[PDB]
């Protein structure tokens, strides 16, 4: 943290943050969500980290170079250590990226190495080559060299993500899935794991072996797993919680802006809220049905009437304010809702649905006040505008993500947040073979548009391709875009260091501090 001249620090430097749900795991290779990554950034540190405004900056690597954007050389700081006092070396990164690529790990983020095009990743994922063939090597203890199969000018931006953080081989090997328990885990971030009580709290304490430990201020941070945004706000206003999770309740939000204006932080956020359709299961494999659902949803009602928290109605997957996004707003989004409804009803009628044989299906969402209230409104809108019947189903976060990968569901509430600020961070998740493709969408045309983005060496050509890729997704009605999120959360006046300037919201508790109050 960088404490400004003149601020008076509290004697006790502890923090309590809500984290939305119970984490899936603390193993960097088994996690895929925001809650998981929030904790991961305090415990595991990769080559680069985000600074407090979100710019990619030195992590374990103090400096790096590239040759033609294909061979990246990372110079690791000599004093980087794990929490047991042992050095963090390039060998740690070799083992860790191999483990991420290895099909035996079954990482949900194995395709992150495809997004960066590390050499030989496709064959490794397919089991055609051993994970030891991956295009990574340690040139010495403090030098990690990555070789890509084609130039990737933004490669370094990918490196702040948890999937490419190092894991401690000896602990993984000796304890298996219990390596993350407090007695066994070893971490290299600013914090260490103190306590993990499932569905109650995760408590982290300062890691004195962290290389930048002298700048760390907060001595202990607790992460809570509260999925009710109303409860989160209640425990924040009672004094227990210092920073809520950034999902706000429909119940109280209006009231909050009027009651505590300076505590309500509202900043840009590269995430898109949408209803994910299982594209591989009839009747959702019919483009007419998917289009009907996309068009009959009334975004103005949801975004401005039922939710109304600063979100913008969406017409795409990639947020239009992503760096590199120059999207074409489709004609259907400019129409009146009445015109969208008529076309939707027409399409469903063409698909064979009638009053006596209506379309009835499930809408899966993870436990949440926000998601439940929005799914109820969406069910009423689709019923009224299109005559379709929806059965709502809630699941807790970890189960919910597994269900979507299992891919026999109908429609699920979904939200993707960028891992790096570039359109492929969204677009690559819709590739036919992506490990993040929970839409189960497979379009050879779409895949080809993305493949061509690194075969041109011009930003305009790349941007026009990303725009065409969004058009391909939209033409196929792969998803039902609802709104682009804003990063809205409550932060006590005494919490310093949270700028809200990072559109990825990559917070590190090592950057925060408690002002005397
Ligand atoms: U004190
Ligand atoms: U650049
Ligand atoms: U940029
Ligand atoms: U269903
Ligand atoms: U509620
Ligand atoms: U460039
Ligand atoms: U106080
Ligand atoms: U106090």
Curated annotation (Swiss-Prot):
Phenotype reported upon loss of the gene: Mutant cannot take up cell wall peptides.
| Gene3D superfamilies xref list | Dipeptide-binding Protein, Domain 1 (3.90.76.10), Dipeptide-binding Protein, Domain 3 (3.10.105.10), Periplasmic binding protein-like II (3.40.190.10)
Keyword Oxidoreductase set for record = no
User: Which GO terms are recorded in the biological process aspect for this UniProt protein?
Assistant: peptide transport; protein transport
Induction line: Part of the opp operon, which is constitutively expressed.
Query: Domain of life here?
Result: Bacteria
Q: Which residues form a coiled coil?
A: none
UniProt xrefs under InterPro entries: Peptide/Ni-bd (IPR030678), SBP_5 (IPR039424), SBP_5_CS (IPR023765), SBP_5_dom (IPR000914)
GO CC entries: ATP-binding cassette (ABC) transporter complex; outer membrane-bounded periplasmic space
Query: Which keywords label this protein?
Result: Disulfide bond, Peptide transport, Periplasm, Protein transport, Signal, Transport
Q: List the disulfide bonds.
A: 271-417
Q: What is a single molecular function from GO for this protein? A: peptide transmembrane transporter activity
Q: Where in the cell is it found?
A: Periplasm
Q: How does it associate, per the subunit comment? A: The complex is composed of two ATP-binding proteins (OppD and OppF), two transmembrane proteins (OppB and OppC) and a solute-binding protein (OppA).
Q: Which PANTHER family does the protein's record reference?
A: PERIPLASMIC BINDING COMPONENT OF ABC TRANSPORTER, PERIPLASMIC OLIGOPEPTIDE-BINDING PROTEIN-RELATED
Give the protein family.
Belongs to the bacterial solute-binding protein 5 family.
Q: What else is known?
A: Isothermal titration calorimetric measurements of the binding of lysine-containing peptides of different lengths to OppA show that the dipeptide Lys-Lys is bound with 60-fold lower affinity than related tri- and tetrapeptides (Lys-Lys-Lys and Lys-Lys-Lys-Ala, respectively).
What's this chain's function?
Answer: Part of the ABC transporter complex OppABCDF involved in the uptake of oligopeptides, including the cell wall murein tripeptide L-alanyl-gamma-D-glutamyl-meso-diaminopimelate. Plays an important nutritional role and is involved in the recycling of cell wall peptides. Binds peptides containing from two to five amino acid residues regardless of their sequence. Also binds cell wall peptides, such as L-alanyl-gamma-D-glutamyl-meso-diaminopimelate.
About its domains, the entry says:
Accommodates the ligand side chains in large hydrated pockets which impose little specificity on binding. Tight binding is achieved by utilising the hydrogen-bonding potential of the main chain of the ligand.
The protein here is known as Periplasmic oligopeptide-binding protein OppA
Query: What does the record give as the organism's lineage?
Result: Bacteria, Pseudomonadati, Pseudomonadota, Gammaproteobacteria, Enterobacterales
Q: What gene does this protein come from?
A: oppA
